[PDB]
Protein backbone atom coordinates (compact mmCIF):
# COMPACT_ATOMS: atom_id res chain seq x y z
CA UNK A 1 0.00 0.00 0.00
CA UNK A 2 0.99 3.71 -0.08
CA UNK A 3 1.62 3.59 3.74
CA UNK A 4 4.64 1.24 2.99
CA UNK A 5 7.30 3.78 1.99
CA UNK A 6 6.69 6.00 5.09
CA UNK A 7 6.76 2.79 7.25
CA UNK A 8 10.19 1.94 5.82
CA UNK A 9 11.35 5.58 6.22
CA UNK A 10 10.21 5.32 9.88
CA UNK A 11 12.12 2.02 10.36
CA UNK A 12 15.19 3.62 8.95
CA UNK A 13 14.87 6.74 11.13
CA UNK A 14 14.55 4.60 14.19
CA UNK A 15 17.56 2.48 13.27
CA UNK A 16 19.67 5.55 12.66
CA UNK A 17 18.57 7.04 15.99
CA UNK A 18 19.26 3.66 17.73
CA UNK A 19 22.84 3.74 16.37
CA UNK A 20 23.20 7.27 17.68
CA UNK A 21 21.95 6.51 21.22
CA UNK A 22 23.31 3.00 21.97
CA UNK A 23 27.08 2.59 21.79
CA UNK A 24 27.18 -1.22 21.90
CA UNK A 25 24.88 -2.63 19.30
CA UNK A 26 23.80 -6.18 19.05
CA UNK A 27 25.87 -6.49 15.83
CA UNK A 28 28.99 -5.37 17.77
CA UNK A 29 28.19 -7.48 20.78
CA UNK A 30 27.87 -10.64 18.58
CA UNK A 31 31.16 -9.93 16.87
CA UNK A 32 32.75 -9.80 20.37
CA UNK A 33 30.90 -12.78 21.75
CA UNK A 34 31.83 -15.04 18.79
CA UNK A 35 35.41 -13.63 18.73
CA UNK A 36 35.08 -11.93 15.26
CA UNK A 37 36.50 -8.48 16.03
CA UNK A 38 40.17 -7.67 15.99
CA UNK A 39 39.94 -5.01 18.79
CA UNK A 40 38.81 -8.06 20.79
CA UNK A 41 39.81 -7.37 24.32
CA UNK A 42 37.24 -8.77 26.71
CA UNK A 43 38.55 -9.49 30.21
CA UNK A 44 36.79 -12.57 31.46
CA UNK A 45 35.43 -12.66 35.04
CA UNK A 46 34.52 -16.14 36.21
CA UNK A 47 35.59 -16.27 39.92
CA UNK A 48 36.75 -14.13 42.75
CA UNK A 49 40.39 -14.15 41.54
CA UNK A 50 39.58 -12.89 38.03
CA UNK A 51 37.17 -10.36 39.53
CA UNK A 52 40.04 -8.90 41.52
CA UNK A 53 42.32 -8.85 38.43
CA UNK A 54 39.63 -7.26 36.23
CA UNK A 55 37.64 -4.98 38.51
CA UNK A 56 39.48 -1.72 37.67
CA UNK A 57 39.12 -2.59 33.99
CA UNK A 58 35.42 -1.96 34.84
CA UNK A 59 32.13 5.21 33.30
CA UNK A 60 31.33 7.35 36.48
CA UNK A 61 34.74 6.33 38.00
CA UNK A 62 35.60 6.22 41.77
CA UNK A 63 36.16 3.71 44.67
CA UNK A 64 33.63 3.62 47.61
CA UNK A 65 35.29 0.90 49.65
CA UNK A 66 34.57 -2.14 51.86
CA UNK A 67 31.31 -3.45 50.38
CA UNK A 68 31.19 -7.17 49.75
CA UNK A 69 31.49 -8.51 46.28
CA UNK A 70 27.86 -9.43 45.69
CA UNK A 71 26.81 -5.90 46.58
CA UNK A 72 29.47 -4.27 44.44
CA UNK A 73 28.29 -6.33 41.49
CA UNK A 74 24.56 -5.81 42.15
CA UNK A 75 25.35 -2.09 42.33
CA UNK A 76 27.49 -2.12 39.20
CA UNK A 77 24.37 -3.34 37.40
CA UNK A 78 22.60 -0.34 38.93
CA UNK A 79 25.04 2.14 37.63
CA UNK A 80 24.89 0.46 34.19
CA UNK A 81 21.13 1.04 34.38
CA UNK A 82 21.65 4.70 35.15
CA UNK A 83 23.58 5.04 31.99
CA UNK A 84 21.04 2.95 30.03
CA UNK A 85 18.17 5.17 31.21
CA UNK A 86 19.95 8.19 29.72
CA UNK A 87 20.54 6.49 26.34
CA UNK A 88 16.93 5.26 26.28
CA UNK A 89 15.64 8.73 27.12
CA UNK A 90 17.53 10.19 24.19
CA UNK A 91 16.22 7.39 21.95
CA UNK A 92 12.64 7.95 23.14
CA UNK A 93 12.90 11.63 22.26
CA UNK A 94 13.76 10.72 18.66
CA UNK A 95 10.50 8.74 18.18
CA UNK A 96 8.20 11.05 16.08
CA UNK A 97 5.38 12.33 18.24
CA UNK A 98 6.98 11.48 21.60
CA UNK A 99 8.25 14.92 22.61
CA UNK A 100 4.75 16.38 21.71
CA UNK A 101 3.14 14.18 24.35
CA UNK A 102 2.16 15.68 27.72
CA UNK A 103 5.37 15.76 29.78
CA UNK A 104 3.66 13.82 32.61
CA UNK A 105 2.98 11.06 30.12
CA UNK A 106 6.56 11.12 28.85
CA UNK A 107 7.67 10.50 32.42
CA UNK A 108 5.22 7.71 32.94
CA UNK A 109 6.23 5.98 29.69
CA UNK A 110 9.91 6.09 30.68
CA UNK A 111 9.22 5.13 34.27
CA UNK A 112 7.41 1.94 33.28
CA UNK A 113 9.38 1.25 30.04
CA UNK A 114 13.04 1.57 30.87
CA UNK A 115 13.50 -1.78 32.62
CA UNK A 116 11.64 -3.72 29.95
CA UNK A 117 14.03 -2.14 27.40
CA UNK A 118 17.05 -2.70 29.65
CA UNK A 119 16.33 -6.42 29.87
CA UNK A 120 15.60 -6.59 26.15
CA UNK A 121 18.99 -4.99 25.29
CA UNK A 122 20.79 -7.02 27.98
CA UNK A 123 19.78 -10.05 25.88
CA UNK A 124 21.81 -8.72 22.98
CA UNK A 125 24.87 -8.87 25.25
CA UNK A 126 24.23 -12.40 26.54
CA UNK A 127 25.01 -15.93 25.43
CA UNK A 128 24.20 -19.05 27.46
CA UNK A 129 27.57 -18.69 29.34
CA UNK A 130 27.64 -15.03 30.35
CA UNK A 131 27.20 -11.38 29.66
CA UNK A 132 29.21 -8.57 28.25
CA UNK A 133 29.99 -5.68 30.53
CA UNK A 134 31.44 -2.19 30.27
CA UNK A 135 30.69 -1.93 26.55
CA UNK A 136 32.41 -5.17 25.64
CA UNK A 137 35.53 -4.65 27.78
CA UNK A 138 34.56 -7.50 30.00
CA UNK A 139 32.62 -10.65 30.13
CA UNK A 140 31.13 -12.02 33.34
CA UNK A 141 30.08 -15.66 33.47
CA UNK A 142 26.59 -16.86 34.31
CA UNK A 143 28.06 -19.41 36.76
CA UNK A 144 29.97 -16.65 38.51
CA UNK A 145 26.84 -14.52 38.91
CA UNK A 146 24.91 -17.59 40.17
CA UNK A 147 27.58 -18.32 42.82
CA UNK A 148 26.87 -15.13 44.77
CA UNK A 149 25.39 -15.23 48.19
CA UNK A 150 21.65 -15.14 48.77
CA UNK A 151 19.70 -13.36 47.41
CA UNK A 152 22.16 -12.02 44.83
CA UNK A 153 22.94 -15.38 43.11
CA UNK A 154 19.59 -15.71 41.41
CA UNK A 155 18.83 -12.08 40.30
CA UNK A 156 20.39 -12.73 36.81
CA UNK A 157 19.09 -16.18 36.18
CA UNK A 158 15.55 -15.07 34.95
CA UNK A 159 17.39 -12.61 32.61
CA UNK A 160 19.64 -15.30 31.10
CA UNK A 161 16.60 -17.59 30.70
CA UNK A 162 14.66 -14.82 28.90
CA UNK A 163 17.74 -14.07 26.72
CA UNK A 164 18.14 -17.60 25.62
CA UNK A 165 14.61 -17.71 24.28
CA UNK A 166 14.64 -14.12 23.00
CA UNK A 167 17.91 -14.59 21.12
CA UNK A 168 16.39 -17.59 19.35
CA UNK A 169 14.25 -15.06 17.46
CA UNK A 170 17.41 -13.85 15.81
CA UNK A 171 16.43 -10.25 15.71
CA UNK A 172 18.92 -7.71 14.40
CA UNK A 173 19.50 -4.08 15.49
CA UNK A 174 17.00 -2.77 12.86
CA UNK A 175 14.33 -4.99 14.24
CA UNK A 176 15.18 -4.09 17.87
CA UNK A 177 15.00 -0.37 17.16
CA UNK A 178 11.33 -0.59 16.26
CA UNK A 179 10.50 -3.08 19.01
CA UNK A 180 12.00 -0.85 21.68
CA UNK A 181 9.95 2.08 20.27
CA UNK A 182 6.83 -0.12 20.58
CA UNK A 183 7.60 -0.82 24.25
CA UNK A 184 8.08 2.85 25.12
CA UNK A 185 4.74 3.83 23.50
CA UNK A 186 2.74 1.48 25.74
CA UNK A 187 -0.76 2.76 26.36
CA UNK A 188 -1.39 0.49 29.36
CA UNK A 189 1.00 2.18 31.75
CA UNK A 190 -0.60 3.31 35.01
CA UNK A 191 -1.50 6.93 35.39
CA UNK A 192 -1.34 7.97 31.76
CA UNK A 193 -3.51 11.06 31.26
CA UNK A 194 -3.88 10.95 27.43
CA UNK A 195 -3.96 7.33 26.14
CA UNK A 196 -5.23 7.95 22.63
CA UNK A 197 -2.21 9.87 21.13
CA UNK A 198 0.14 7.23 22.61
CA UNK A 199 -1.83 4.37 21.10
CA UNK A 200 -2.02 6.20 17.79
CA UNK A 201 1.79 6.49 17.69
CA UNK A 202 2.14 2.90 18.85
CA UNK A 203 -0.16 1.61 16.11
CA UNK A 204 1.95 3.25 13.48
CA UNK A 205 5.16 1.75 15.09
CA UNK A 206 3.50 -1.64 15.22
CA UNK A 207 2.69 -1.44 11.52
CA UNK A 208 6.31 -0.48 10.95
CA UNK A 209 7.51 -3.45 13.00
CA UNK A 210 5.31 -5.98 11.18
CA UNK A 211 6.58 -4.78 7.82
CA UNK A 212 10.21 -4.81 9.05
CA UNK A 213 9.88 -8.40 10.25
CA UNK A 214 8.16 -9.60 7.12
CA UNK A 215 10.91 -8.13 4.93
CA UNK A 216 13.85 -8.92 7.16
CA UNK A 217 12.75 -12.44 8.23
CA UNK A 218 10.79 -13.61 5.28
CA UNK A 219 10.97 -17.30 6.34
CA UNK A 220 10.07 -16.75 10.08
CA UNK A 221 6.34 -17.34 10.46
CA UNK A 222 4.36 -15.40 13.06
CA UNK A 223 7.57 -13.68 14.11
CA UNK A 224 5.60 -10.52 14.81
CA UNK A 225 3.20 -12.21 17.24
CA UNK A 226 5.97 -14.17 18.93
CA UNK A 227 7.90 -10.93 19.49
CA UNK A 228 4.87 -9.09 20.85
CA UNK A 229 4.27 -12.09 23.24
CA UNK A 230 7.76 -11.38 24.66
CA UNK A 231 6.34 -8.11 26.12
CA UNK A 232 4.41 -10.40 28.56
CA UNK A 233 7.57 -12.14 29.73
CA UNK A 234 9.35 -8.76 29.99
CA UNK A 235 6.57 -7.41 32.19
CA UNK A 236 6.94 -10.41 34.52
CA UNK A 237 10.82 -10.08 34.61
CA UNK A 238 10.41 -6.50 35.75
CA UNK A 239 7.71 -7.08 38.36
CA UNK A 240 9.68 -10.01 39.82
CA UNK A 241 12.83 -7.89 40.04
CA UNK A 242 10.89 -5.11 41.78
CA UNK A 243 9.78 -7.65 44.39
CA UNK A 244 13.28 -8.95 44.96
CA UNK A 245 14.36 -5.37 45.56
CA UNK A 246 11.62 -5.01 48.16
CA UNK A 247 12.98 -7.95 50.13
CA UNK A 248 16.52 -6.60 49.80
CA UNK A 249 15.62 -3.10 51.09
CA UNK A 250 13.87 -4.67 54.11
CA UNK A 251 16.91 -6.96 54.83
CA UNK A 252 20.40 -5.76 53.60
CA UNK A 253 21.83 -3.13 55.94
CA UNK A 254 21.85 0.01 53.72
CA UNK A 255 22.58 -0.41 50.10
CA UNK A 256 21.15 2.84 48.81
CA UNK A 257 19.79 3.08 45.32
CA UNK A 258 21.18 5.59 42.86
CA UNK A 259 18.79 8.52 42.90
CA UNK A 260 17.67 8.02 39.26
CA UNK A 261 16.72 4.46 40.09
CA UNK A 262 15.14 5.61 43.41
CA UNK A 263 12.80 7.77 41.32
CA UNK A 264 12.04 5.13 38.76
CA UNK A 265 11.25 2.43 41.30
CA UNK A 266 9.28 4.68 43.75
CA UNK A 267 5.58 3.64 43.37
CA UNK A 268 6.38 1.10 40.65
CA UNK A 269 4.14 -1.98 40.96
Amino acid sequence: GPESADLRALAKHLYDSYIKSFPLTKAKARAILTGKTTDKSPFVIYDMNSLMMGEDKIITPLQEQSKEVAIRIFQGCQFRSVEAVQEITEYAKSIPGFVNLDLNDQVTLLKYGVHEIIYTMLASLMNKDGVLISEGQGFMTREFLKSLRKPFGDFMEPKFEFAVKFNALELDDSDLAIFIAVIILSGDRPGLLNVKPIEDIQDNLLQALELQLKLNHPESSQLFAKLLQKMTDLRQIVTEHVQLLQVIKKTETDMSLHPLLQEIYKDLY
Binding site: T89, Q106, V107, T108, K111, G191, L260, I264
Partner: peptide, 19 residues
Protein backbone atom coordinates in the same frame (compact mmCIF):
# COMPACT_ATOMS: atom_id res chain seq x y z
CA UNK B 1 2.50 15.27 41.74
CA UNK B 2 4.24 13.06 39.17
CA UNK B 3 6.98 15.18 37.55
CA UNK B 4 7.85 16.45 41.05
CA UNK B 5 8.38 12.86 42.16
CA UNK B 6 10.63 12.43 39.01
CA UNK B 7 12.95 15.44 38.92
CA UNK B 8 15.79 13.84 37.10
CA UNK B 9 13.69 12.14 34.37
CA UNK B 10 11.86 15.38 33.93
CA UNK B 11 15.17 17.22 33.34
CA UNK B 12 16.49 14.51 30.97
CA UNK B 13 13.23 14.69 28.95
CA UNK B 14 13.33 18.52 28.63
CA UNK B 15 17.01 19.38 28.58
CA UNK B 16 18.99 16.18 27.81
CA UNK B 17 21.88 14.63 29.76
CA UNK B 18 24.49 17.08 31.11
CA UNK B 19 28.09 16.20 30.26
Amino acid sequence: SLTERHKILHRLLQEGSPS
